Amino acid sequence: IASRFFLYTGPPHVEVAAEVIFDGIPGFPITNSFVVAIIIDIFVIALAVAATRNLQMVPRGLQNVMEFILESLYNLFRNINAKYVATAFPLVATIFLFVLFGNWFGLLPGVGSIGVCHPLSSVAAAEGEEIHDTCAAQGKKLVPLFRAPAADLNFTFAIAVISFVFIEYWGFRALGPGYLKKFFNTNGIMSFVGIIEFISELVKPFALAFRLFGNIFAGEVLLVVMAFLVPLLLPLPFYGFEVFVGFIQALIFALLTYAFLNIAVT
Amino acid sequence: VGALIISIASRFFLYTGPPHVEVAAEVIFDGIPGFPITNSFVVAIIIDIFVIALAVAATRNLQMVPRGLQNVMEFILESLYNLFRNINAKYVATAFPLVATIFLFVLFGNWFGLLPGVGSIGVCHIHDTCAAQGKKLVPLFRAPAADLNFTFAIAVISFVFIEYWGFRALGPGYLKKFFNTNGIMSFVGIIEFISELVKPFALAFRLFGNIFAGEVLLVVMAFLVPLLLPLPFYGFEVFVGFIQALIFALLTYAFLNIAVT
Amino acid sequence: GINPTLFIAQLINFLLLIFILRALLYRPVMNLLNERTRRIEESVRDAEKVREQLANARRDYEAEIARARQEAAKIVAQAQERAKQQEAEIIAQARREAERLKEEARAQAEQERIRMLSEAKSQIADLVTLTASRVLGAELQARGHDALIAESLAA
Amino acid sequence: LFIAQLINFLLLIFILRALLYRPVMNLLNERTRRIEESVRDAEKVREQLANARRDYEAEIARARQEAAKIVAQAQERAKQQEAEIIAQARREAERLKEEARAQAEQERIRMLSEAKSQIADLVTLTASRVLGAELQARGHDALIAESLAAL
Amino acid sequence: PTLFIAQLINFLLLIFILRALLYRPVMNLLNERTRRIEESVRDAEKVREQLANARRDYEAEIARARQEAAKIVAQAQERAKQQEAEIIAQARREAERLKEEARAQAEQERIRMLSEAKSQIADLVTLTASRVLGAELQARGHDALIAESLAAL
Amino acid sequence: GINPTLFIAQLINFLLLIFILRALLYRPVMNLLNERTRRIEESVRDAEKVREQLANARRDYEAEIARARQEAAKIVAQAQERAKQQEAEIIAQARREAERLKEEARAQAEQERIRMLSEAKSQIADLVTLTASRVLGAELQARGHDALIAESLA
Amino acid sequence: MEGLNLVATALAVGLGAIGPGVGIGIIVSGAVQAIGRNPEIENRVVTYMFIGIAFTEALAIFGLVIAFLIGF
Amino acid sequence: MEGLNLVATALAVGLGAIGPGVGIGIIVSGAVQAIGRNPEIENRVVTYMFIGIAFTEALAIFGLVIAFLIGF
Amino acid sequence: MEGLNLVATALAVGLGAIGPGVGIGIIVSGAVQAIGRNPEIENRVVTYMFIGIAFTEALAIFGLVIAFLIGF
Amino acid sequence: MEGLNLVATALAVGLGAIGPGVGIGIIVSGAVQAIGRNPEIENRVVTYMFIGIAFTEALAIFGLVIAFLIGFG
Amino acid sequence: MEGLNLVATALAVGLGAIGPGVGIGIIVSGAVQAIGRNPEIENRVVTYMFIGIAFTEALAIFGLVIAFLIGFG
Amino acid sequence: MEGLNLVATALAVGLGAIGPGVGIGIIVSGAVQAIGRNPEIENRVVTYMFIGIAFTEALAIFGLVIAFLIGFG
Amino acid sequence: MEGLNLVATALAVGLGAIGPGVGIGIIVSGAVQAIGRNPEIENRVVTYMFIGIAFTEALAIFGLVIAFLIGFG
Amino acid sequence: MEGLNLVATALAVGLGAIGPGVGIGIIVSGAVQAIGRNPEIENRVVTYMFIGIAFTEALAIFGLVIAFLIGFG
Amino acid sequence: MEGLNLVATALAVGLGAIGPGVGIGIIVSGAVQAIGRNPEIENRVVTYMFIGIAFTEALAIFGLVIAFLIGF
Amino acid sequence: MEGLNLVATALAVGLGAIGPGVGIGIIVSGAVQAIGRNPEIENRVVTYMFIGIAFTEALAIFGLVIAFLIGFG
């Protein structure tokens, strides 16, 4: 139990870098985050149609758990506000599921070990292994073809801005000219607090995107470093923490979106 | 009195010079071929004589009704006895004399350090008196608790007392504690052991630092304004000397209480 | 990665994914909602039907007593009226027979009265013979009773 | 690198299958049982409603048919007894009427026994009649003398 | 140096301050403690006096108890001789009464026998007279008395 | 201050102080406090004894009086029993002596028989006048009754 | 001397983590206690709680943004 | 040297985040708990809460303005 | 160096935001809780709250004006 | 001087641990106390606690990510 | 290296103000809460509140004046 | 100018002990305070206590990982 | 460096003025809240409050003394 | 630099005393508070308290190990 | 590097003032709170209050003594 | 450069004092509150509070002995 943590086989170092631009032989260049985003979209649609092609009473199997999750989401969003518990449900549900599966993708082996490339070898008396990679030739970096979609600041910014636009539009859907009444109404000190309110409303999507991107990228980096330190039997609790926090942050994003919607409409 | 005190600017006419009193150790006061006499051993002997004199004066008559000095002597002993009875039940008589003596002695030691002439009067070896001559000025009647040796002495005798009365009360159970528990008292026990080991160090350092800080505060307030400025600090110091005495006694008794139990 | 072309493409992809959500999410939402609505409607239906059935069997048992009530009421009326007429006829028959029996008895008495006219002379002869021993010496004619006896018979 | 990720992943699942297996199975089992009692419960709102019509049809048929038959059977038993007991006592009254015929015989006996009752006044009181008619003329002077001698 | 005079004036001011705001509380607390001692002292001597009086009262009360006990008993002995004497004297007076009434009863009984004998001798002389009267009327006929009896009618 | 020799000298000085102080005032002040707390506790103890003495004195005085009257009533009854039994003795002795006085007097009164020896003077002579002088015409000439009268007078 | 910009960015991000982190913690604990005391006011308390979190996160975002400005 | 301005701006923003962040956190927690205790005085306590938050965020904005001035 | 003045004014403003900010937060939280528990003494407790706010803001103004003088 | 980047990385990570750690501790303590006092509203208390943990740990991850950016960029 | 005086003065005022600021905040919060519980003892409450505020302001004033002494000769 | 890596490693370890240590302390204090007044809710509250402890220890692990990385490069 | 003495004196004042300030505030708030209920213990609670205030001012004045010593050698 | 290792060990041990010290303090305060509230849940309280104490002391142990590694090299 | 010992002494005294100062404040506040809630237990409480006061002052005096040793 | 040992010792002592002081303060406050609420559990209260104060003082002693090793050795 306490003698099988050999460091003889492992990565040579720790690789940290934002998603690497893909080869993009044809026009409209893509990234390694875009392809995993599309494949996870495909997986989400496949599970949705699997739960959809067989829709009936007393669900069992995949459909039963899917309906459990969906009704739990209804219960959670209903506790905030039932006025828009269904109108805004598809957006937050889709973003939730996609972020969930993106965070799940980071645990899959080959993320960072597969390189698209556009014991004895390990150093003795050292805590980290020094085995040269497959792509170590040509002075390459072994570009990770597989990566977490939320570990890129393009998707996170995109969902943040679309969520902000959705919230602002649905607040503007039925509020009249009450926005200007909440922002610098020139009524004593109420004008001052509206300015900070306006700035906070502006920075909410940026905060969400940066938070999610940082969470996922930090999880990936810490898992890579824990693998580099000791190969086996060490990073189990941290892998468990990652698989927990991925789902946790996934539900948090949707919950925060609904909460911002409610605080804007009310 | 009016708050418009104008004597606050006496530093111009009365400038005391830099705080030359900075010694963290003793100075020899009585040149003797034998062991040297510290500036604190002399005041230790002085306090011994004073305490003996007050005790014999309060016990020369042994009046049934305590009046005058007898009542004053009896009140503090009554208070200490009641306090230790509140702490522990059957160990009040066993430990009372040592704790009462170590309270009174350091009380009068700290209260002596506020006496005038402690920081000023001294034997020759702005410019004081001796520095006018070629000889340096060393102070006279340095506080006993200011000297580290006396504080270490009372701390180590307190440690000897607590270890003896733990070992005597609990036999070999206190001597090795319960290290063989291996469930809880295998890592808590060593922490308790090192805490006991450093307990005399903390006990001595508390008194030493408190009294040293007190006297250097006295000298500093004299340096800044030697008129009406150090009065609140002196009141604080005569308070905290008694406080530290009672603290040292109370903690040594309570440590014995937690050791025996 | 800070470029306008990538950000616009990501925004367009997000907009398309959000637009695609409208058709798909309506499926499971309807699947959960339609079931609940049908259940509530069927529950109202059950309450109503059960209440109706329960309140009708009790009334049928009440009509069972009511049917028996008419059965008992007809019984007394049929029994009493028939008995009263039968008793009246029997008493009238008794009354008619009482007139008949009494009349026949009176007729027989009247007949016997005249018929016994053969008994006045009979008792005359009885005094002539049986009273003879009651008088002196059982001499039927005595000493003149003979002719006198004839006068008694004539009387 | 790859061996580092592989060994960690399998061992993590092995302890997830030891702790986060029974509660996660039990929650889905409880929900499925609730839907098993609740999908069935929804079929029931209409199932009991359908059974309500069955219950109503059965109860009405069982009660009304039996009620009509039993009450009429009780009525027929009572109606027949109503006429029968009425006629049964009529013959007993006719039996009491036969006592009047017996009373007529007693009346007939009275007149037949009156063949000596009214005759007694004619016969037992015709003794003094002969005393005045037959005895009067009859010369019983000798009998009178004999009676005087007996005196 | 100026250090000594500064220390002296500061210590004098501290002593003045303490005498100003601590002489009264210290002295009144000491006086209260002395009064508490004296009350306990006065309590102890009073209880000792109470015990001595309670002890003294115990023998004093039992002493008069003995005096009253013997006095009551002596009265009982005094009453005993008087009660015994009067019953004897009553009986002695009663006994003499029986002696006197016996003499009167006996003397009366003597008269009763005297009257009884007087009735007896009257009875004998009456009874013997009847016997000899019948003998005397055996010789002389009864007709003389019978004729005399009718003559009185 | 590092020198262990002067350190130990200060230690020994302080130990001498604790011994001389505990021998000089601590034992006197402690045993004075102990005697004081004995005095107050016996004062409560004696206060209870005061109540017991008061209760005992009242009770025992009554008990002494009670045993006095009980003994006094006892000797009174003994004298009463002696008197009644002596009185009944005197009455019975007088009663028996009175009865024997009646008997002797009656025996002394039995002398009517002796006085009945004078029948010749009275019984015979009174009989003669009774027979003759009053119930008859004094004509008792028929003799022979003199035998009858003497025979029946015995 | 190397680039003090790295140390500046680090200090800014770290203190923006220090302050608003404790602010959010206190806000959420108080809101949870108030909800446990009175669930009938949950809408109002969650609204004001999200207002407070918005302000704290606004301060933290100010720190992060000026850190990015220092970095570039 | 060179990055003294950067370090100054970063430190100013960071400290203005650590202080006011905890201040507004305590304000919001206390106000939410008081609202949970008393919904009737909600308007008054919300006005006072916003007054305190305005003062605290004004101090934070003073820090941010000083940082921007130094950066300019 | 030639930028220590910037560091000085930055630190002064930052700590002036640190201390009085937390003081304001605690004052407002306590005052709001006391108002919620008892609205009848609201005027008096608001007066005392604003007195404490004035003292803390005086400390903050002292720090800010020291930074102002240093900046010049 | 020379190794300022490592010092910056360490400082960022350390203060990011300082702040959100206290925030998470306070949030969890409050949530646990409320649940123990009211075991019926935990269905919403747990969610509010977790969304508070989000806002706390976001700043810690901010510091960690900034530290990696400095140490690797 | 001559700017150390300004940095010293700023550090002195800021760090001598942070402590008393929190102290005053806690003092006023406690006093206001206690007055809310009982308004009739408000005189003594206010007296001790100003006592504590005076102590904290004395510490802050000591810091400010020693900053002036550092800032000047 | 040379030993800065050691200073950075020490700072990272120390502050990653500062934050999560107080977080764990507050979490445990709240948990024991809640469990004192409600014994049967232990099954519910121990899970949340372990969740908060795991998050704080994750922050401490972030600090330790950074310190180990900069203690070797 | 030449200017370290001024920064040292300023630090000895400012850092030494943090903990005493918070302690003073906490002591005064606790004493006021304690005297809010049952003010009949005013003398004793004021005695203990002044003991605590003496200890806090002791720490603050140790800081002040150290700063004055550094500022004047 | 000639130093920077003594300073490193000092910082590590000092901050490891900062964090876990306050954590253990709050743990003990809450535990004794609950014990005063609930006497008979003492076994569970002590078990959870010692679990939290060990979790908190883990960081202090990490700091001590880092300091010893720096001191030895 | 002249004057570095001065900064050492300053830092030692400052931190030793920070820690035990807050400790003493908390101890005294808890003690007076318990005395106000129940005056009868004061005789038992004051002993442990002074024990804690001594334990807190131990670290501050440690700091001051080490500062004096460093200075001399 | 040459005085880093003194700064190391001073920082070690100060940072080892800043934390455990607050820890033992909150320990004593909690124990005092528990005693004021429940005197019958005083024995267990005293044992647990002294165990906790021993742990915190052990952390402080770790800091102090590290400072001693830095100053000499």
> CA-CA distance, N60 to E84, in Å (whole number)?
114
Write a three-state SS string for chain P. Answer: CCCHHHHHHHHHHHHHHHHHHHHHHHHHHHHHHHHHHCCCCHHHHHHHHHHHHHHHHHHHHHHHHHHHHHHCC
CB hemisphere CA count around P16 (13 angstroms)? 33
Is residue H28 within 8 Å of residue H6, measured between CB atoms?
no
* Residues of chain G in Cβ contact (below 8 Å) with chain A: 42-43, 46-47, 50-51, 54-55, 57-58, 60-61, 64-65
Resolution in angstroms for this experimental structure?
A: 4.1
Q: Among residues K26, N27, M49, which one has the least CA distance to residue O35?
A: M49
Q: Residue B36 gets which letter from DSSP?
A: P
> CA-CA distance, F110 to F114, in Å (whole number)?
8
Q: Among residues P13, P64, F7, which one has the least CA distance to residue B147?
A: F7
CA distances from K45 to J60, K29, K32, M42 (A): 42, 12, 9, 11
CB-based contacts of H67-72 (< 8 A; 24+ apart in sequence): H67/G66, H67/H8, H67/H9, H67/H12, H67/H13, H67/H16, H67/I10, H68/H9, H69/I71, H70/H5, H70/H8, H70/H9, H70/H12, H70/I6, H70/I9, H70/I10, H71/G69, H71/H5, H71/H9
> CA-CA distance, M10 to K12, in Å (whole number)?
5
CB pairs under 8 A between H and I: 150
Q: Do P36 and O45 touch (CB under 8 A)?
A: yes
Q: Among residues A101, A109, A103, which one has the least CA distance to residue A231?
A: A109
> CA-CA distance, O26 to O20, in Å (whole number)?
10
> CA-CA distance, M15 to O13, in Å (whole number)?
8
> CA-CA distance, D9 to D17, in Å (whole number)?
12
DSSP 3-state of A115 = strand
* Experimental technique: cryo-EM
DSSP 3-state of A144 = strand
In the CATH scheme, what architecture does the domain H4-71 have?
Up-down Bundle (1.20)
Q: Among residues J27, A79, H28, which one has the least CA distance to residue G39?
A: A79
L-chain residues near J25 (CB < 8 A): 22-27, 52, 56
Among 3.40.50.300, 1.10.10.60, 1.20.20.10, 3.20.20.70, name the CATH number for the domain at N6-19+28-72: 1.20.20.10
DSSP 3-state of N38 = coil
Residue C73 CB: number of other CB atoms within 10 A?
12
Q: Which residue of A has its CA nearest to L67?
A: A225
Q: Among residues A136, H26, A50, O70, which one has the least CA distance to residue P5?
A: O70
F-chain residues near E116 (CB < 8 A): 112
Angstroms from H10 CA to nearest CA on chain G: 5
- CB-nearest to G28 from J13, J33, J49 is J49
For residue F97 the two structure tokens come to: 């002596």
Residue B137 CB: number of other CB atoms within 10 A?
22
Q: Among residues I59, D104, L17, which one has the least CA distance to residue C106?
A: D104
Q: Distance between terminal CA atoms of chain H?
A: 17
Chains J and A touch (3+ CB pairs under 8 A): yes
CA distances from H51 to B138, H54, I28 (A): 62, 5, 9
Cβ partners under 8 Å of residue B130, min gap 6: B122, B123, B124, B136, B137
Residue type, E50: Q
* Residues of chain J in Cβ contact (below 8 Å) with chain A: 44, 47, 50-51, 54, 57-58, 61-62, 64-65, 68, 72-73
Q: State phi, psi for B258 to the nearest 5 degrees.
A: -75, -25
For residue A252 the two structure tokens come to: 């948090």
Q: Distance between terminal CA atoms of chain L?
A: 16
Chains N and F touch (3+ CB pairs under 8 A): no
Q: Do B192 and P46 touch (CB under 8 A)?
A: no
CA distances from O5 to M3, O68, P2 (A): 13, 10, 10
CA E70 to chain centre: 16
Q: Which helix (H) or strand (E) holds D29?
A: helix D22-112
> CA-CA distance, P63 to P55, in Å (whole number)?
13
P64 and chain N: CB distance < 8 Å anywhere? no
Chains F and B touch (3+ CB pairs under 8 A): yes
Q: What are the beta bridge partners of residue A21? A: A31
Q: Distance between terminal CA atoms of chain E?
A: 191
B-chain residues near F34 (CB < 8 A): none
* Radius of gyration of chain L, Cα coordinates, nearest whole angstrom: 17
Q: Residue O41 gets which letter from DSSP?
A: G
> CA-CA distance, M18 to K15, in Å (whole number)?
7
Listed in sequence order, the DSSP H helices in chain J are 4-37, 42-71
Among 3.20.20.450, 1.20.20.10, 1.20.1250.20, 3.10.25.10, name the CATH number for the domain at L4-70: 1.20.20.10
Q: Among residues E132, E133, E114, E128, which one has the least CA distance to residue F153?
A: E128
CA distances from A111 to A143, D1, D2 (A): 10, 11, 10
Q: State phi, psi for B114 to the nearest 5 degrees.
A: -90, -5
DSSP 3-state of B124 = strand
Is residue M14 within 8 Å of residue K8, measured between CB atoms?
no
- CB-nearest to F6 from B38, B48, B55 is B38
Is residue B256 within 8 Å of residue B122, measured between CB atoms?
no
Cβ partners under 8 Å of residue O38, min gap 6: P36, P37
> CA-CA distance, O8 to P70, in Å (whole number)?
13
CB-based contacts of F34-43 (< 8 A; 24+ apart in sequence): F36/B64, F36/E40, F39/E40, F39/E44, F40/E40, F40/E43, F40/E44, F43/E43, F43/E44, F43/E47
- CB-nearest to E4 from B114, B116, B228 is B116
Is residue I28 within 8 Å of residue I49, measured between CB atoms?
yes
Q: Residue J41 gets which letter from DSSP?
A: T
Q: Do F25 and B58 touch (CB under 8 A)?
A: yes
For residue L48 the two structure tokens come to: 């949340």
For residue F96 the two structure tokens come to: 């028996």
Give the CA dihedral K31, K32, K38, K43, nearest 10 degrees: 60
- CB-nearest to J62 from G17, G26, G49 is G17
Residue B176 CB: number of other CB atoms within 10 A?
10
Q: Locate the domains of chain E by residue range.
A: 2-151
N64 and chain L: CB distance < 8 Å anywhere? no
C-chain residues near A37 (CB < 8 A): 13
CA A234 to chain centre: 25
For residue F35 the two structure tokens come to: 């005697």
B-chain residues near M72 (CB < 8 A): 18, 223
Q: Do C14 and A159 touch (CB under 8 A)?
A: yes
CA distances from C56 to D45, D50, E51 (A): 20, 16, 100
Which candidate in B13, B15, B63, B65 is best for mutational testing of the E interface (most E CBs within 10 A)? B65
Q: Residue E120 gets which letter from DSSP?
A: H
CB hemisphere CA count around L50 (13 angstroms)? 9
What b/e sequence results for H17-34 when a residue is b if at least 16 CB atoms lie within 10 Å of its CB, and e otherwise?
bbbbbbbbbbbbbbbbbb
Q: Do J64 and L60 touch (CB under 8 A)?
A: no
Q: Distance between terminal CA atoms of chain M?
A: 16
Q: What are the beta bridge partners of residue B37? A: B30
* Radius of gyration of chain I, Cα coordinates, nearest whole angstrom: 16
Listed in sequence order, the DSSP H helices in chain B are 41-59, 69-87, 92-112, 148-170, 172-175, 188-224, 231-260
Residue type, D7: I
A-chain residues near L65 (CB < 8 A): 222, 225-226, 229
> CA-CA distance, B86 to O42, in Å (whole number)?
12
Is residue M26 within 8 Å of residue O23, measured between CB atoms?
no
- Rounded to 10°, the helix I42-71/H42-71 angle is 0
For residue D122 the two structure tokens come to: 């004619």
> CA-CA distance, B73 to B59, in Å (whole number)?
9
> CA-CA distance, G38 to G41, in Å (whole number)?
6
Is residue M70 within 8 Å of residue K71, measured between CB atoms?
no
Which candidate in F29, F36, F41, F46 is best for mutational testing of the E interface (most E CBs within 10 A)? F46
Is residue P26 within 8 Å of residue O24, measured between CB atoms?
no
Cα dihedral G46, G51, G56, G57 sign: positive
G64 and chain H: CB distance < 8 Å anywhere? no
* Residues of chain B in Cβ contact (below 8 Å) with chain F: 25-26, 35-36, 38, 41, 44-45, 48, 51-52, 55-56, 58-59, 62, 64, 73-74, 77-78, 81, 93, 96-98, 100-102, 104-105, 147-150, 152-154, 156-157
J-chain residues near L2 (CB < 8 A): 2-3
Angstroms from B116 CA to nearest CA on chain M: 20
Is residue B139 within 8 Å of residue B131, measured between CB atoms?
no
N21 and chain L: CB distance < 8 Å anywhere? yes
Q: How many residues make up chain H in this entry?
A: 72
Q: Do M33 and K33 touch (CB under 8 A)?
A: yes
Q: What are the beta bridge partners of residue A115? A: A144
Is residue C87 within 8 Å of residue D90, measured between CB atoms?
yes
CA C45 to chain centre: 45
Q: Distance between terminal CA atoms of chain G?
A: 19
> CA-CA distance, C89 to A177, in Å (whole number)?
108
Residue N39 CB: number of other CB atoms within 10 A?
14
Q: Among residues F83, B145, K20, which one has the least CA distance to residue M60?
A: K20
> CA-CA distance, A65 to A63, in Å (whole number)?
6
Instruction: State the residue for tokens 């949340």.
Output: L48
Chain breaks of chain N after residues with C–N above 2.5 Å? none
Is residue B19 within 8 Å of residue B220, measured between CB atoms?
yes
Listed in sequence order, the DSSP H helices in chain F are 4-21, 27-108, 112-115, 119, 125-129, 145-152
